[PDB]
């Protein structure tokens, strides 16, 4: 929706966008286009650079204050009493285009970072790839008692055990399949085949989606168990759901979930038994299944074709609780038998 | 609607309200009430003064930033890792209670201030009594060509002819009957018996009300004419409409208009011919009619009783274009034959 | 905000307002004003009655469907392919003007209706005077356990004990001082000097107001006690708060509360000790205090003048728990020692 | 956001969603879970099928009315006075999953339907693939005078020249590159490198996106010219922008545009000169370039790989003004030298 501001010469113009939304200049003029605006003692006074000046000073910002005068703008009509007229919009914060571009085909998964050894055998952690932020999101695994999400301002604060805040979730969580995308938490509602969307900035449930025919609550989890039936994943294409159905004889089923409309945007049936998989993740719309040790299966959703592979994966620890791909830094956010680690990817 | 913020010890809590809305602390606790919030190495840790500290620091403000720690709060439980949990609302800016309290019964109208002599014989001007501001709103009278409202930051800037901004109205204006109340402009839409509500902060029409059976467009104006058929008025009770109907044989009819719901909240029929009145205004729900020179008639809406009076009014100039009462400063904002003046009131 | 609809000849126009909001036609034309609208094989084709037809068919309705054709509209230009263009707004439902007009000065309170004898000694009940509805709202009094409001579709259903719905309140209630106004419940939040606004249609808290310096939780209740410290009241002027302050030595203090902005719009200090009052209510901005038996004191907020009176009140029962005035039907909604009654008023 | 309804036995529950949004049942119970709800003369009374009954009766509907009683629900506790308690959300209308699934690789483009021969040599037309509707959207090409979009209820009404409505656009349109997606019109704003989003249901601009470095206004159009610089396209992946940049030496550049966030989600540089292309379109994230006669070039965005091809295209007419792919019916919506046609696709 179009927002409007106008200030007479020597007065500032004030632009402000709600929450995390940012300014986008639609139009701007410094001069005079009307004989009634800004009462004083030439209605064809235009400054073509007014649009450029306002865009440079205000675009990508939550707020802007610009004085309508000679300190900021050249004079398009000396002698004429001028005014600054601006039309603008509040748009979601911009995202670096690399987040949506495929880095290539996965050659292997390798050790990279070892953050710390937690006192919890299972759990999950990630970053929001749509944000240029150092924020880490952490959800520990406690059977039948998980309903919180802890936020850390950096990796350094995360290792030191220094949280910024904690979120009380509207429902209990089943498994370690959680993801954070564009300021929203996505999780599997305990004892349901539903995904809950929880807005972190306003601390309220912003929606719910039913994952049609998805098996739930220790019916089709990963090898380790722990109610891992439904796993969410983020990649270059958006948000995904990794689960299994009786219709597909307990084999992995993958669906694209629109994070804004909560619609299921395409479903693909794989040939890999979910109970046999230690974990799984998406990269460029391709499902990578972990066996434990190695990636032994891939499913390409773009071609609707699968293949048997022998892609390396770290053999260090046994209890693989969570594996989350990040399309911003191209790293795997892993929870493996108490150890909180980051794995590099070779393309 | 309830808004929530939470920050772990040493981190700041950030409260922000949209537009001109202000913070109201609902609840606050600095301590520990839950064993899962703010992950670290006593769930009955309360600070009773947390509510008082937050209220003092954040109430009546657009924004607030408070660090959850020993610089701002005492320690309710030394050794326990604490967090600040706050529940708050965004409410319209508070108004000094005097604005709604009757100063008394009017003894007379007297000269007080003479701002300047305009080049326009007719027009109208006022301040928003619900705002603690020096802002002046000005609408000149130009037959069939009025569609702007000019704003000045102070009396000083108004006399000097230094405007802050100008508003382009969605429709043309009939007469000098305009008023500003709680950030909204109220005016009579040209060639209609309708009142338009225009939000000044967002620069959009926020509503419309039809003044049932009101005479319009030089049918029942004030003595001077100029399409003065419908006059808006602000007092201790709110917003009023001063007009005339054929049902009341062209005599003044007064209605209370709710500025928030746009409903007509009571209508009273007077015995004064509107065409004979130079102008009129409300004080404490009492209509005061000007003849030119003197106030010769009053109508009390609380009692539904009228009386003939001889209340003094300045005899200086003839062409009385506008008379607007202000319940904050208890002054009359008058436009009389080019002269822009303020009249004092003796109670 | 302006809403727009347009349909080519023979097609229907569909107008819809959210919730309880109603249509108000701003403008309408059946004909042709543009050479590009409604593509077919005269751009000055107007029907003046189009505005009248649309207003008659759509005003005061939640929804409207009108066919753009000869069954509903005359032909302003035969041969020319026409279209119906409408501009409209969604406004709060209209209210009969009598609700805001003073019936007169109270001569006495008299018995009228005896609905039923409840099993609860104390409680409160009312109707929403801003709605043309038979709905009754009921709140029983249970010490430290009150957090529900029950709704009945009629008097008949209320006596029979046939509820339509129950509302779970966000907080516990202190006393029997509750009121319903313009679809919103107003109550005193347990162990606070705060008034909570709860929207009944959406079932959420819509705001909160602090009653500055108000005594609360068995400090200054009515004679019967039961945490009656703060009593809400509805009359021709709007919403009121009846309470007491230490600043006024425990004597009744009355404040106008804006139900839309949650602002305190004027405060008046009375000379009647609240602990000595059995109950109190407002009519035309005048406070009427009950002693038990009789009305022995009045306070006129319009004049800021009080008087000692001897106004009759029914002597039938002793334990007067609640007295709520209704400005639509001009009756008192009373709860007296198990008996749920309506009292008439002589003006 | 969660919406709540509750009705006591024999009373109906009413669920309504705004605009085109549909109901999604979150939770439902017919019975008794609380001793205070629905006042009458067992707080563990549950009906497991209540969720199933409500979902079946209300899911995918704008509105729902269900009576809380024995005509619709079995009795989970005879003798106990029951109530129906429902929690629900309003979600965007569901979309058939085929719209997001790739039909295969394009073997050729073939003649299928010939609707009519227009009096306009150039123009554009389409359907909204996210809607299960017969609605056709039409924009004729008139140099420097295009600012309207006409809607037809069916193919039959479109051929007959019987429109339902016309939309007045906030800005003039450059070229025939328009698209309709999820109730929103997307077009290139005249003399700019910007895409405007216009909501058809509310008739207002809902956003704007700048296509960084895009050539505009007869700099890089298709062979026929007519300000075709920027072309929008819809496929299984969403919304795309087909344009050219000086950085890519006037060769086709393709970008994914998020229709909800207005963000550019990935950009790919092709090797095909845009001025040499008659038109272009996307299918499964693959760009197909038309030469006139044949498809002689493809660019796969999933692989970031291009190939020279010889894919058939109808040789019937010369002046190819628009080619729009539809992912619901897998047809090309084409405007070729006055003729309005549909082309089939062989996979
Ligand atoms: C700021 O806004 C401009 C305007 O479109 C956009 O092009 C740019 O990508 C955004 N991000 C940055 C870092 O400038
Ligand atoms: C700030 O907020 C408090 C909280 O109710 C209110 O009492 C006060 O009147 C308002 N205004 C000022 C100037 O403090
Ligand atoms: C319907 O709308 C009209 C338009 O202003 C209004 O005058 C009238 O009072 C309202 N109420 C009824 C019952 O018509
Ligand atoms: C109705 O709602 C259900 C609930 O998720 C959904 O599964 C289904 O796909 C939607 N569409 C139809 C045609 O039922
Ligand atoms: Ca995973
Ligand atoms: Ca006046
Ligand atoms: Ca009372
Ligand atoms: Ca195309
Ligand atoms: Na996951
Ligand atoms: Na006025
Ligand atoms: Na009350
Ligand atoms: Na297009």
Residue numbers in the entry:
A (entry chain A), B (entry chain A), C (entry chain A), D (entry chain A): 97 to 137, 143 to 393, 405 to 459
Source paper text:
Latrophilins, receptors for spider venom α-latrotoxin, are adhesion type G-protein-coupled receptors with emerging functions in synapse development. All LPHNs have a large ectodomain of approximately 1,000 amino acids, with an N-terminal lectin domain, followed by an olfactomedin-like (Olf) domain, a serine/threonine-rich region, HormR domain, and a GPCR-autoproteolysis inducing (GAIN) domain containing a GPCR proteolysis site (GPS). The N-terminal region binds the endogenous cell adhesion molecule FLRT, a major regulator of cortical and synapse development. Here we present the crystal structure of an N-terminal fragment of murine LPHN3 comprising the lectin and Olf domains (hereafter LPHN3Lec-Olf).
We expressed secreted murine LPHN3Lec-Olf in human embryonic kidney (HEK) 293T cells using established protocols to circumvent the formation of heterogeneous glycans (Aricescu et al., 2006), and determined the crystal structure to a resolution of 2.16 Å. The structure reveals two globular domains separated by a 17-residue linker (residues V192–K208). The structure of the LPHN3 lectin domain agrees closely with the lectin domain of LPHN1 solved using solution NMR (Vakonakis et al., 2008) (root-mean-square deviation [rmsd] is 0.86 Å for 90 aligned Cα atoms). The Olf domain folds into a five-bladed β propeller, with each blade consisting of a four-stranded β sheet. The fourth strands from blades I–IV largely form the periphery of the disk together with the Olf domain N terminus (β0), which contributes as the fourth strand to blade V. A disulfide bridge (C203–C385) connects the region upstream of β0 with blade IV and appears to stabilize β0 in its position. Notably for an extracellular protein, LPHN3Lec-Olf contains a reduced cysteine (C227) buried in the core of the Olf domain. In the electron density map, two potential metal atoms were visible approximately halfway through the central Olf channel. The result of this analysis points to calcium (CBVS = 1.767) and sodium (CBVS = 1.560) for the octahedrally coordinated and pentacoordinated ion, respectively. LPHN3Lec-Olf exhibits a sequence-conserved patch on the Olf domain, stretching across blades II and III of the propeller. We conclude that the FLRT-binding site involves conserved surface regions on blades II and III of the LPHN3 Olf domain.
